Amino acid sequence: YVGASFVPYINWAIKDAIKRGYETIYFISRDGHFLKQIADKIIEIRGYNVKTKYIYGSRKAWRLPSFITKVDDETFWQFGNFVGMDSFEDLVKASYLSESELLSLFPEFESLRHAKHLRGEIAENIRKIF
């Protein structure tokens, strides 16, 4: 099952990358751990002329630093930062701010201390506040 799910895709991607002229293929953390093993085996067997490298990173480690001159509006929408949060400390961690700093900017959030469902309309309102 997992072969039928991964190996045909990586074979296609390698052939297409060669066809487009890419010399180096970077596989990114977590997802690339298995995919790069597959790709290396394919390249060895087929003698394909292309290098592979592994790079570490995640949405967490890359989205925030990418705020060069503005905080993307995506940050305050459905696939943004304040999503899937199931507790007040989850809101804290999503805000990037320490607990005290968060309560200092937005004192109203103190009323959300003991809640345990910060999804739905409440999340949209919190996004509008931030």
Partner: protein, 130 residues
């Protein structure tokens, strides 16, 4: 367009409602809003105010009516961001012998925070949810 007698109250409001509605200018009625000129001091009163207040009105320096509107696209959390700390509001209104009357727009009564505070201060001497 054929049977609606629309009640305008001023030239500005008449022009506004003509802009925003599909009414017949020749069916416009000009006068007062009945709800603004019927329940006067010696007007009509279907209930005694004192049966709804925690104390007789005389025992309050000021009767305050907080009557916000509904914000478009948000309901859950609006009231909390408008009145985050009901405890301190109660303290202040007590020290001042003020009766703070929460009369939110009907659409806003579904904010979970609204129900929470309405139950929390159902017997409050200085905060009254209408």
């Amino acid at each position: 367009k054929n049977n609606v007698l629309f009640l305008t109250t001023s030239q500005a409001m008449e022009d506004h409602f003509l802009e925003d509605m599909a009414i017949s200018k020749e069916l416009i009625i000009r006068g007062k809003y009945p709800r603004n000129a019927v329940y006067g001091p010696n007007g009509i009163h279907t209930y005694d105010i004192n049966t709804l207040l925690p104390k007789n009105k005389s025992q309050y320096s000021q009767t305050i009516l907080f009557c916000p509107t509904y914000r478009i696209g948000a309901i859950q959390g609006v009231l909390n961001s408008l009145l985050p700390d009901f405890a301190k509001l109660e303290e202040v209104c007590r020290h001042k012998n003020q009766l703070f009357i929460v009369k939110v727009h009907p659409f806003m009564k579904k904010d979970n925070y609204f129900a929470e505070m309405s139950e929390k201060y159902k017997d409050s001497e200085y905060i009254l949810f209408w």
